[PDB]
Design a binder for this molecule. Structure first.
Ligand SMILES: COc1cc([C@@H]2c3cc4c(cc3[C@H](Sc3nnc[nH]3)[C@@H]3COC(=O)[C@H]23)OCO4)cc(OC)c1OC
Ligand SMILES: COc1cc([C@@H]2c3cc4c(cc3[C@H](Sc3nnc[nH]3)[C@@H]3COC(=O)[C@H]23)OCO4)cc(OC)c1OC
Ligand SMILES: Nc1nc2c(ncn2[C@@H]2O[C@H](COP(=O)(O)OP(=O)(O)OP(=O)(O)O)[C@@H](O)[C@H]2O)c(=O)[nH]1
Ligand SMILES: Nc1nc2c(ncn2[C@@H]2O[C@H](COP(=O)(O)OP(=O)(O)O)[C@@H](O)[C@H]2O)c(=O)[nH]1
Ligand SMILES: [Ca+2]
Ligand SMILES: [Mg+2]
Ligand SMILES: [Mg+2]
Ligand code: NA
Ligand code: NA
Lengths: 440, 51, 423
């Protein structure tokens, strides 16, 4: 009951999926062969972690997940990697030819060859659920598969599962971490196409994560492994309420009520703390007040933007570990007298708090320090439109010359789809302006 | 008997009001069904047309 | 004269289960349903709330659209005592959404509940009516609960409907949509209940923080107040004495105009216990009527009492109670209406609650309750003028028109209460 199925699309989605499922296993005490010695109900159960793991009669705990990519070499590393035994071979789906950084090939030319198979595997997972809650979809904006195949998959999921909820973790492109020149095109195309099909989308700016790794973990040039371990901690914070329970636990769906005031305004800003090296964590205990304070520092955002220059329509604090509400309330009282926290005039100004007691874990031999308490803030701020403005500007620069547009037309697309997608982004930006304006 | 009949008239008005509530309840849920189905049909047709 | 108790949603079942723990103790019923008490006032009217191997079973129906909280009741101290077939629950939940409780998720489950209601009502020698516990801020208690009330009225139109309705407050809030759910629910209650005890989470929080000096109040703290109130407010229904009250006499005597049936309870002494100094009758009467002791965040001095019913519990001077009760009216005659003579009545019961040698409980029909509906109306309007968060409801089939009509009906209610504050 309340199962969530995760779908990992393209290289970014798959590699982040590797990191996330490894972290889940460590948090839950599941070994790489899928055995979970603490779990006394063999082959089934209704425990909180069963929202994310099914069980075989042989004691294996299997991610409710599908990994899909149009080339094989990233999923092959899952097939041969440390956690190969976690997954049934049928959950890992690959084609032979990727989308060549081209939305059109991911959505149409190549993607249409494998979409029916992907949907048949997802159906196989859904059929094992007694009360499917929805989907979590992991993908980049910029790749041909992450943009184009994900939009196709989302459109098909709406047809096959109705209004069943679909949440995204979307990797927003940054020049620092490698990136095709056409990624602004792919980003706008997939954002426009998926907008009506997604209920809530957590954007993750690769530049934000890159900066956090360089600045807080003192890593000179972070790798994908560095970025994805940090990303998995944010994902884990956000899904922890689904996977654990406790008296102070608040379900992600309750936060979602507060975070989405209009269907299209569904892009929360995530901030996480604390991110600290082993050397600095040793002999330093970060208190509740300390980590809370860190959420309001822009350097700790998942997306680069300035909330001081927008307005809030919601603020949610997801705590894990050694945290009691008394310390939370005090920390928030302090924050509210020292920070620029301006809400829109049509929404209440309370912070919604949840506490998950299970403490955070880290991957042994990684760079993140193990801490006793952490927090992820989810806010809905009009400032997140700065991220769309930045992407729309790069789009416009190229599109006014039609640079690279022939690679999409060659695959059957029309310029009409470009201007329609760009107009939808313009209306999105205007939506964010309108909701921040004071009421008459 | 005239007072009894007045009680009966008032109960009948009441049950008639509650009957109007039940039909509104029916209209709301069939409206939700109709809109979910029209979403699915719209999405299916746009996808087919664009492919 | 049997009462059928229904508890719906998370809040409903939590304050519901506390109510049964408290009164089961007062009547000497242990968690396993066997009576092991020491007095016979305990069993004389036991059948008002319990059915009868000489074990007693609460005439209680437990309803929720998700199984969580009712798993918690079944594991709690008195969980063994409820009739297992009277647990009626779904799996989907209501997502803090009135529309889901009232129109989609709840509609699926409501007929099962009415089958259990019907069975309980058939084993009734003479059914007084119904008592429902729920909040107005969520989805199941609010949306499905008012749907139940409507279906119950249609099947038992000549029986009394009584609710303990927990009103939401930004000071103790789960979601931003609470004003929407509460406004939609108040409309249902104005039409389909005969008596509603307004239990205001803002007042309970204030009382826990200021008076009880609990700086981090939990729902457990709030529910300690609600439990004490529910016990005191039902005393004359459950115990024999001078005045044997029932739900219909309650309504005839406290409700001068059919829509103004929303009561402010009050209680004394307020406790989080920890104190052994029993209060003098003067002190009970003083605190009970103090604003700082009322479970709805309304200033009675901002309005007028239409009717008041007070009950004193424990052993104490009947003569001193009458003297202090008469003192409070004769000293603040301005806060009682002139056009309802002798509108304050007082009862006594020898059997005190638990941990208290004497207590006082107050039922008031005060025009100051309009402040609570104004507060909600303001919060409702702040979002609704921008149609904020409405898609959660239109996605379930609802139209904006229904919100407009609910806003209108609640403002009418506020107006009607003000009409009689100036009479
Ligand atoms: C085979 O030779 C190369 C090709 C590219 C080239 C390539 C060439 C480019 C370019 C981008 C990109 C993209 S980069 C990308 N990273 N993630 C997604 N896409 C892609 C990637 O793979 C590629 O092959 C593309 O911008 C201007 O010139 C790049 C090269 O080095 C930088 C290689 O130099 C020999
Ligand atoms: C539900 O508990 C109570 C109810 C009443 C209540 C009740 C409530 C009233 C009221 C009168 C009356 C009358 S009193 C009466 N005595 N003989 C005939 N009628 C009646 C009797 O039965 C009732 O139920 C009525 O005036 C204003 O508010 C009163 C209470 O205490 C005074 C009780 O506890 C506070
Ligand atoms: N954070 C993070 N970003 C990644 C990772 N892998 C790729 N990216 C980013 O994703 C974008 C490129 O998309 P990919 O996922 O690699 O491409 P794809 O989905 O496989 O699409 P095609 O190869 O064109 O078929 C660029 O912005 C990359 O920086 C990763 O492991 N972690
Ligand atoms: N006093 C009190 N209020 C509660 C309790 N639980 C929830 N609430 C309030 O009830 C409203 C939320 O409704 P809830 O009962 O949880 O939702 P439901 O299960 O869909 O009916 C909010 O206003 C909460 O503050 C409780 O145990 N005691
Ligand atoms: Ca140090
Ligand atoms: Mg690729
Ligand atoms: Mg709740
Ligand atoms: Na199990
Ligand atoms: Na259903």
């Amino acid at each position: 009951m309340r199962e969530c199925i995760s779908i990992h699309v393209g290289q970014a989605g798959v590699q982040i999926g590797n990191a996330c499922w490894e972290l889940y296993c460590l948090e839950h005490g599941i070994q790489p062969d899928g055995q979970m010695p603490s779990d006394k109900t063999i082959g089934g159960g209704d425990d909180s972690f069963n929202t994310f793991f099914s069980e075989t009669g042989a004691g294996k705990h299997v991610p409710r997940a599908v990994f899909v990519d149009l080339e094989p070499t990233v999923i092959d590393e899952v097939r041969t990697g440390t956690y190969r035994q976690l997954f049934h071979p049928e959950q890992l789906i690959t084609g032979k030819e990727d989308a060549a950084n081209n939305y059109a090939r991911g959505h149409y030319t190549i993607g249409k060859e494998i979409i029916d198979l992907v949907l048949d595997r997802i159906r196989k997972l859904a059929d094992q659920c007694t009360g499917l809650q929805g989907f979590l979809v992991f993908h980049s904006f910029g790749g041909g598969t992450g943009s184009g195949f994900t939009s196709l998959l989302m459109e098909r999921l709406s047809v096959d599962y109705g209004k069943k909820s679909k949440l995204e973790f979307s990797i927003y492109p940054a020049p620092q971490v490698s990136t095709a020149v056409v990624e602004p095109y792919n980003s706008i195309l997939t954002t426009h196409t998926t907008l009506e099909h997604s209920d809530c989308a957590f954007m993750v700016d690769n530049e934000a994560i890159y900066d956090i790794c360089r600045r807080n973990l003192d890593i000179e040039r972070p790798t994908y492994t560095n970025l994805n371990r940090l990303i998995s901690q944010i994902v884990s914070s956000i899904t922890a309420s689904l996977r654990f329970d406790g008296a102070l636990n608040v379900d992600l769906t309750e936060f979602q009520t507060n975070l989405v005031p209009y269907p299209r305004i569904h892009f929360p800003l995530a901030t996480y703390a604390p991110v600290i090296s082993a050397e600095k964590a040793y002999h330093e205990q970060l208190s509740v007040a300390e980590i809370t304070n860190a959420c309001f520092e822009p350097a700790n955002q998942m997306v680069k933007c300035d909330p001081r220059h927008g307005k809030y329509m919601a603020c949610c604090l997801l705590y894990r570990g050694d945290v009691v509400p008394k310390d939370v309330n005090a920390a928030i009282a302090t924050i509210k007298t020292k920070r620029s926290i301006q809400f829109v005039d049509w929404c209440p100004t309370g912070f919604k708090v949840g506490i998950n007691y299970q403490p955070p874990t880290v991957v042994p031999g990684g760079d993140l320090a193990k801490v006793q308490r952490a927090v992820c803030m989810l806010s809905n701020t009009t400032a997140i439109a700065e991220a769309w403005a930045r992407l729309d500007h790069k789009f416009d620069l190229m599109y006014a010359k039609r640079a690279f547009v022939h690679w999409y037309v060659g695959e059957g697309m029309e310029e009409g789809e470009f201007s329609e997608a760009r107009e939808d982004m313009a209306a999105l930006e205007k939506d964010y302006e309108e909701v921040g304006v004071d009421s008459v | 008997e005239a007072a009894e009949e007045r009680r009966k008239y008032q109960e009948a008005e009441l049950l008639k009001h509650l009957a109007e509530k039940r039909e509104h309840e029916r209209e709301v849920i069939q409206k939700a069904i109709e809109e979910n189905n029209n979403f699915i049909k719209m999405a299916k047709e746009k996808l087919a047309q664009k492919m | 004269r049997e009462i059928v108790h229904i508890q719906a949603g998370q809040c409903g079942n939590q304050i519901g289960a506390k109510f049964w723990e408290v009164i089961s103790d007062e009547h000497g019923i242990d968690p396993t349903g066997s009576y092991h008490g020491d007095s016979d006032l305990q069993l004389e009217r036991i059948n008002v709330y319990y059915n009868e191997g000489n074990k007693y079973v609460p005439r209680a129906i437990l309803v929720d659209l998700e199984p969580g909280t009712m798993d918690s009741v079944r594991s709690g101290p008195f969980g063994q005592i409820f009739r297992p077939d009277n647990f009626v629950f779904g799996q989907s939940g209501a997502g803090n959404n009135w529309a889901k409780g009232h129109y989609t998720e709840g509609a699926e489950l409501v007929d099962s509940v009415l089958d259990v209601v019907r069975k309980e009502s058939e084993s009734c020698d003479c059914l007084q009516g119904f008592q429902l516990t729920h909040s107005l801020g969520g989805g199941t208690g609010s949306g499905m609960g008012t749907l139940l009330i409507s279906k119950i009225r249609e099947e038992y139109p000549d029986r009394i409907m009584n609710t303990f309705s927990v009103m939401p407050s930004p000071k103790v809030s789960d979601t931003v949509v609470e004003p929407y759910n509460a406004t939609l629910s108040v409309h249902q209650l104005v039409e389909n209940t005969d008596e509603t005890y307004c239990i205001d989470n803002e007042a309970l929080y204030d009382i826990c923080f200021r008076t009880l000096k609990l700086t981090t109040p939990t729902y457990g703290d709030l529910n300690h107040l609600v439990s004490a109130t529910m016990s005191g407010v039902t005393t004359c229904l459950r115990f024999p004495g001078q005045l044997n009250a029932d739900l219909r006499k309650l309504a005839v005597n406290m409700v001068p105009f059919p829509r103004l049936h929303f009561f402010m309870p009050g209680f004394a002494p307020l406790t989080s216990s920890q104190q052994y100094r029993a209060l003098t009758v003067p002190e009970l009467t003083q605190q009970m009527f103090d604003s700082k002791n009322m479970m709805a965040a309304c200033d009675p001095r901002h309005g007028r009492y239409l009717t008041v019913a007070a009950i004193f519990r424990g052993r104490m001077s009947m003569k001193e109670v009458d003297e202090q009760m008469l003192n409070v009216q004769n000293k603040n005659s301005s806060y009682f209406v002139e056009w309802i003579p002798n509108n304050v009545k007082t009862a006594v019961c020898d059997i005190p609650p638990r941990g208290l040698k004497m207590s006082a409980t107050f039922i008031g029909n005060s025009t100051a309750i309009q402040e609570l509906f104004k507060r909600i109306s303001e919060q409702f309007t702040a979002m609704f003028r921008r149609k904020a968060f409405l898609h959660w409801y239109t996605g379930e089939g609802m139209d904006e028109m229904e919100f407009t009509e609910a806003e209108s009906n609640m403002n009418d209610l506020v107006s009607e209460y003000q009409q009689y504050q100036d009479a």
